[PDB]
Design a protein around this motif. Structure first.
Motif, PDB file in Angstrom:
ATOM      1  N   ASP A 272       1.030  -1.097  -0.224  1.00  0.00           N
ATOM      2  CA  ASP A 272      -0.201  -0.052  -0.335  1.00  0.00           C
ATOM      3  C   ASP A 272       0.539   1.559   0.383  1.00  0.00           C
ATOM      4  O   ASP A 272       0.560   2.436   1.102  1.00  0.00           O
ATOM      5  CB  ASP A 272      -1.280   0.102   0.966  1.00  0.00           C
ATOM      6  CG  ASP A 272      -2.135   0.991   1.225  1.00  0.00           C
ATOM      7  OD1 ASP A 272      -2.659   1.489  -0.078  1.00  0.00           O
ATOM      8  OD2 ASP A 272      -2.316   1.312   2.227  1.00  0.00           O
TER       9      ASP A 272
ATOM     10  N   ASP B  13      -5.780  10.158  -2.298  1.00  0.00           N
ATOM     11  CA  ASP B  13      -6.680   8.997  -2.629  1.00  0.00           C
ATOM     12  C   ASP B  13      -7.661  10.007  -3.623  1.00  0.00           C
ATOM     13  O   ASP B  13      -8.507   8.864  -3.335  1.00  0.00           O
ATOM     14  CB  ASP B  13      -7.418   9.164  -1.350  1.00  0.00           C
ATOM     15  CG  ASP B  13      -5.990   8.159   0.042  1.00  0.00           C
ATOM     16  OD1 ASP B  13      -5.417   7.372  -0.676  1.00  0.00           O
ATOM     17  OD2 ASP B  13      -6.228   9.082   1.130  1.00  0.00           O
TER      18      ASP B  13
ATOM     19  N   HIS C 229      -2.364   0.069  11.963  1.00  0.00           N
ATOM     20  CA  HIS C 229      -1.841  -0.918  11.108  1.00  0.00           C
ATOM     21  C   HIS C 229      -0.517  -0.756  10.601  1.00  0.00           C
ATOM     22  O   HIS C 229       0.247   0.043  10.399  1.00  0.00           O
ATOM     23  CB  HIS C 229      -2.624  -1.458  10.460  1.00  0.00           C
ATOM     24  CG  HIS C 229      -3.119  -0.580   9.176  1.00  0.00           C
ATOM     25  ND1 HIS C 229      -4.198   0.064   9.387  1.00  0.00           N
ATOM     26  CD2 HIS C 229      -1.911  -0.253   8.261  1.00  0.00           C
ATOM     27  CE1 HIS C 229      -3.672   1.024   7.939  1.00  0.00           C
ATOM     28  NE2 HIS C 229      -2.932   1.053   7.595  1.00  0.00           N
TER      29      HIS C 229
HETATM   30  C1  LIG Z   1      -7.506   4.497   1.706  1.00  0.00           C
HETATM   31  C2  LIG Z   1      -8.614   5.738   2.156  1.00  0.00           C
HETATM   32  O1  LIG Z   1      -9.942   5.298   2.781  1.00  0.00           O
HETATM   33  C3  LIG Z   1     -10.843   5.476   4.047  1.00  0.00           C
HETATM   34  O2  LIG Z   1     -11.367   7.042   3.200  1.00  0.00           O
HETATM   35  C4  LIG Z   1     -12.425   6.562   1.341  1.00  0.00           C
HETATM   36  C5  LIG Z   1     -13.334   6.237   2.430  1.00  0.00           C
HETATM   37  O3  LIG Z   1     -13.784   5.169   3.116  1.00  0.00           O
HETATM   38  C6  LIG Z   1     -14.701   5.784   0.543  1.00  0.00           C
HETATM   39  O4  LIG Z   1     -15.688   5.820   0.965  1.00  0.00           O
HETATM   40  C7  LIG Z   1     -13.725   6.837   0.320  1.00  0.00           C
HETATM   41  O5  LIG Z   1     -15.269   8.063   0.567  1.00  0.00           O
HETATM   42  C8  LIG Z   1     -15.866   9.105  -0.320  1.00  0.00           C
HETATM   43  C9  LIG Z   1     -17.134   9.028  -0.035  1.00  0.00           C
HETATM   44  O6  LIG Z   1     -17.408   7.361  -0.204  1.00  0.00           O
HETATM   45  C10 LIG Z   1     -18.637   9.536  -1.284  1.00  0.00           C
HETATM   46  O7  LIG Z   1     -19.545   9.452  -0.957  1.00  0.00           O
HETATM   47  C11 LIG Z   1     -17.743  11.253  -1.801  1.00  0.00           C
HETATM   48  O8  LIG Z   1     -17.936  11.705   0.029  1.00  0.00           O
HETATM   49  O9  LIG Z   1     -16.702  10.922  -1.634  1.00  0.00           O
HETATM   50  C12 LIG Z   1     -15.787  10.006  -0.575  1.00  0.00           C
HETATM   51  C13 LIG Z   1     -14.474  10.505  -0.727  1.00  0.00           C
HETATM   52  O10 LIG Z   1     -14.051  10.421  -2.173  1.00  0.00           O
HETATM   53  O11 LIG Z   1     -12.936   8.133  -0.131  1.00  0.00           O
HETATM   54  C14 LIG Z   1     -12.498   8.377   0.853  1.00  0.00           C
HETATM   55  C15 LIG Z   1     -10.960   8.516   0.183  1.00  0.00           C
HETATM   56  O12 LIG Z   1     -10.287   7.451  -0.088  1.00  0.00           O
HETATM   57  C16 LIG Z   1     -10.660   6.237   5.472  1.00  0.00           C
HETATM   58  O13 LIG Z   1     -11.454   6.447   5.564  1.00  0.00           O
HETATM   59  C17 LIG Z   1      -9.565   7.011   4.359  1.00  0.00           C
HETATM   60  O14 LIG Z   1      -8.793   6.545   5.967  1.00  0.00           O
HETATM   61  C18 LIG Z   1      -8.414   5.768   3.963  1.00  0.00           C
HETATM   62  N1  LIG Z   1      -6.768   6.989   3.733  1.00  0.00           N
HETATM   63  C19 LIG Z   1      -5.778   6.529   4.332  1.00  0.00           C
HETATM   64  C20 LIG Z   1      -5.768   5.156   4.727  1.00  0.00           C
HETATM   65  C21 LIG Z   1      -4.838   3.842   4.059  1.00  0.00           C
HETATM   66  C22 LIG Z   1      -4.345   3.249   4.337  1.00  0.00           C
HETATM   67  O15 LIG Z   1      -3.274   3.291   5.471  1.00  0.00           O
HETATM   68  C23 LIG Z   1      -4.315   4.596   2.934  1.00  0.00           C
HETATM   69  O16 LIG Z   1      -4.097   3.606   1.637  1.00  0.00           O
HETATM   70  C24 LIG Z   1      -3.924   6.302   2.227  1.00  0.00           C
HETATM   71  O17 LIG Z   1      -3.296   6.545   1.486  1.00  0.00           O
HETATM   72  C25 LIG Z   1      -4.410   7.038   3.644  1.00  0.00           C
HETATM   73  O18 LIG Z   1      -4.246   8.037   3.074  1.00  0.00           O
END
Ligand SMILES: C[C@H]1O[C@H](O[C@H]2[C@H](O)[C@@H](O)[C@@H](O[C@H]3[C@H](O)[C@@H](O)[C@@H](O)O[C@@H]3CO)O[C@@H]2CO)[C@H](O)[C@@H](O)[C@@H]1N[C@H]1C=C(CO)[C@@H](O)[C@H](O)[C@H]1O
Ligand SMILES: C[C@H]1O[C@H](O[C@H]2[C@H](O)[C@@H](O)[C@@H](O[C@H]3[C@H](O)[C@@H](O)[C@@H](O)O[C@@H]3CO)O[C@@H]2CO)[C@H](O)[C@@H](O)[C@@H]1N[C@H]1C=C(CO)[C@@H](O)[C@H](O)[C@H]1O
Lengths: 517, 522
Positions: free
Chosen positions: B58, B321, B101
């Protein structure tokens, strides 16, 4: 100084060699990572199984665009880096020419399906009216090589069933009409396109194909294995005009390009016509590949190959279509390994070229216990599970003992396009490279000694009598003995004083020894 | 003097910034070569995506050792020199805290796999027996964020399939058990280690993570995107004790350390608890990031952000992301660029801090057309090829028009399109109308005229597709619509400072204008 006459060629089944991005599919980036290992083994060339745009219904041998790399394998840019690096390591590069048929996804076949009977679009393929009062019978009685009818009926514009098209292999592999001039024109451009990128030659898929009898006559022997060879479906005089044109095309380059044919015909006279000086450079000597472990059968197949092959055949003991040698010679892992070691040491001493199928240098067995749902070979589905197919020799290779995919990738086991058995790590390349007695080390030693001590200009001089369990011959100052039997063997003093050079394990049972004279 | 209140932070995705040693992978020597350009652009700080030792399944967020630099990126002493040089240019440095993690390659997890069920080694993670008569069902119904089950079954030392471990993200990212006391102890040491090297603060990955409901209950909503928020998997009360602990540690330094959380919660009220005075300094205002190009939606997201952020939120329009702004707003290069220019100019006028994702200052689009063999995001494989993933915003940056890699190197780990050279930094630097020049002008003007604590004063309504406000003597108008807009005389005589498009009082379509009151004219 490289010579196709004596080349040792490593056959790369790209989908299962090395997976650089971890999606479970071997790719060109992964081949780049593994080229060092092929060169360090001692090979002179590589042959890539088809990596063109393909829906993979026959895993690359159903081609939808002959001028593009499949996106699952990489880009043209990555291909060019494979060729550049292979050349830098002293390796020549053969591609796979699949011109008997294309994928039904190919633009030309999509056009044929959308056109009417008798159209030029259908004239580039083999469409015929069906028989029976409603056209419901196939136009003749030919079998697909993969099982079932060699014909599939299509739906016409008004929605009714209509003509049938011929496919020697899968239903998704329609055969070209090689009597149509656009077909030969298309494939001359395919040759020139890939030769322009530095490809050194082609392995020709189904070289006994392309032309069929103009009448497409029923096979008078019936259907199935006891029908015998279908003389109207294969091996027609016009195919030698084709190979004269391809040879002339390749001989324009410097050095000239190289063609090796995959030819399956029953008669040695018919095979020899493909090998005339203005046609194909070589063809695989399949008689030896199909023999069981038996001294008399091995010698006769070797004699047959040398007599048609004008002295320098293309030998091979396995490929992506047959069971791995360790399994064929086991009738038992210990027994199959001992015999595979002796067979490899014997064939690499024969005059001519040798084709090594990836994983044979590791002594991999065939994986016969794949779950039903994992099999992908069209032979498995077309036979209703009565024929296992070829997936067991196409399992992604083990590179390291550690790792969820044994170093095939850095990814999870569930990614690999076919599943690796949990014991595959026991055969890992890195383990064998550190063991001088391993199958890998035996191949390294064989290729180094073959280059040092043998010359393609040295023909076989048989020493053993026909019919013996011990096969023996001289080439130059080297004497080769393969003891197929269960009894040890002392070479008779009349053959001259012998100093050992290497052995696949007196000549012990089921062992090959090379000696200096 | 620098203040976190209105810092402009350049987000450095190190793997794709600049490659100094020619292996196709961005590294610390490449960042060192580009620090001058970041400072010249007008940024006040950098945030580095994770550059610790990692097998990159990742791409840095699967960490194998938290007290290291990955060898592909450089050494610890080269990192030290990057921090010194960034500080010498006036830049603060944020690192990435990834504490939900670790990589399955981490020594603790290798020890867990090697140990028996019920061991202390496994107690630092979340191992459970499976359900079903032979343990063949996962312990509960949770989804991985990347697709598939949130659990992976292991082989025990007797060769039987045995326990399952929980991973919120990839199978190679096992989640810690944050109720095990060694986990908190480990991450307090991680903070002190990097703080001792002069790091100024941390961006906190998955700040709504760490603690799960102790019973790991099934999510009653089901699976997939319509299941709704999984309340048992995220956002537990114990996480606030964690941030009180980290903030108490950071507050002892001079100046105090800085924490900004990556928080994805369903309700903005739930965001506020993370921003209490004894917890995190800020959190990304993702409400604005997810809005389409629309004046009503933008205004409501800005109002919400200002309320949650106590007047000084952390704005961002893109990151590593999500799809790049030019693609989200265009979805169509010309229209996407026009809107992304107008959006950057509006966001940089809001009170608070702003996070600029590398490449957004060049106006790059998402690269949506990658071959299957080039995709590396675990989302690609875990979705069986049905979700594209994030690789399209992580393409190595173009620096020069010339060169096989447009000056990123001298093959790249992700391939750059043939058309990336049109966006090269050096070309844009010589063009006063470029996206890069617009960012430079916005940042200089922001520092001169929006350097104070003046809040937003919304201006009177004048139509559905216009957003307009004033901060002190600076008036900001964004015309979201397709028609030109003439401001009313009621707002006062406006002298233009800059605009997101190249001599009238009217605001052209899809344009943001900054102006000043009281200049003695007309
Ligand atoms: C990678 C990222 O995943 C998680 O956040 C994501 C949400 O779970 C998704 O549902 C999506 O959100 C979208 C909504 O569903 C949609 O209704 C609209 O509001 O647009 C939103 C954004 O497009 O996308 C979110 C972001 O990707 C999770 O909560 C977040 O913490 C995660 N980001 C970090 C986590 C990891 C794991 O260590 C890495 O892979 C990422 O690079 C980090 O930045
Ligand atoms: C796939 C292959 O089909 C045809 O060739 C022969 C088969 O490969 C063999 O099974 C052959 O049977 C002999 C056994 O190999 C041998 O061990 C011994 O038991 O004797 C058997 C005699 O029955 O039967 C087939 C013909 O005798 C075909 O001629 C050959 O060209 C085919 N190989 C290529 C063709 C296609 C289609 O594009 C691909 O699917 C293959 O991968 C190509 O390599």
């Amino acid at each position: 100084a490289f010579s196709w006459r004596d080349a040792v060629v490593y056959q790369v089944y790209l989908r299962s060699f090395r997976d650089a991005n971890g999606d479970g599919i071997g790719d060109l980036g992964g081949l780049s990572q593994g080229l060092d290992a092929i060169a360090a083994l001692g090979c002179d060339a590589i042959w890539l199984n088809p990596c063109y745009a393909s829906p993979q219904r026959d895993h690359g041998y159903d081609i939808a665009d002959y001028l593009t790399i499949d996106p699952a394998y990489g880009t043209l840019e990555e291909f060019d880096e494979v060729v550049r690096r292979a050349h830098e390591l002293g390796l020549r590069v053969l591609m796979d020419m699949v011109a008997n048929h294309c994928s039904s996804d190919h633009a030309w076949f999509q056009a044929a399906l959308a056109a009417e009977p008798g159209s030029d679009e259908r004239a580039r393929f083999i469409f015929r009216d069906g028989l029976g009062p409603d056209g419901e019978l196939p136009p003749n009685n030919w079998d697909s090589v993969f099982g079932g009818l060699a014909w599939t009926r299509v739906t016409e514009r008004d929605g009714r069933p209509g003509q049938w098209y011929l496919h020697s292999f899968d239903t998704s592999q329609p055969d070209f009409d090689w009597r149509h001039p656009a077909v030969a024109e298309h494939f001359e451009n395919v040759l020139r396109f890939w030769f322009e990128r530095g490809v050194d030659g082609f392995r020709i898929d189904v070289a006994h194909g392309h032309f069929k009898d103009a009448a497409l006559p029923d096979h008078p022997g019936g259907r199935g294995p006891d029908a015998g060879h279908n003389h109207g479906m294969w091996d027609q005089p016009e195919v030698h005009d084709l190979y004269r044109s391809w040879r002339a095309l390749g001989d324009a380059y410097e050095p000239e390009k190289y063609f090796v044919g995959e030819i399956w015909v029953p008669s040695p006279d018919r095979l020899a016509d493909y090998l005339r000086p203005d046609e194909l450079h070589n063809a695989f000597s399949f008689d030896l590949l199909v023999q069981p472990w038996n001294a008399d059968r091995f010698r006769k197949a070797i004699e047959t190959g040398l007599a048609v092959g004008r002295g320098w055949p293309a030998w091979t003991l396995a490929n992506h279509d047959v069971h791995r040698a360790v399994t064929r010679y086991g009738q038992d892992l210990d027994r199959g390994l001992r015999r595979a070691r002796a067979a490899a040491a014997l064939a690499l001493a024969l005059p001519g070229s040798m084709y090594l199928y990836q994983g044979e240098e590791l002594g991999l067995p065939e994986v016969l216990d794949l779950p039903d749902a994992a099999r992908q070979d069209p032979i498995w589905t077309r036979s209703n599970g009565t024929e296992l197919g070829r997936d067991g020799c196409r399992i992604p290779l083990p590179w390291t003992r550690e790792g969820r995919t044994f170093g095939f990738s850095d990814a999870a086991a569930a990614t690999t396009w076919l599943p690796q058995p949990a014991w595959f790590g026991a055969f890992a390349r890195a383990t064998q490279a550190a063991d001088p007695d391993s199958m890998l080390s035996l191949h390294r030693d064989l290729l180094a000694t073959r280059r040092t001590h043998l010359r393609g200009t040295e023909p076989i001089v048989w020493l053993s009598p026909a019919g013996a369990e011990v096969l023996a011959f001289r080439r130059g100052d080297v004497v080769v003995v393969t003891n197929f039997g269960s009894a040890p063997f002392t070479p008779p003093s009349a053959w001259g004083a012998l100093s050992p050079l290497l052995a696949s394990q007196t000549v012990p049972p089921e062992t090959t020894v090379w000696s200096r004279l």
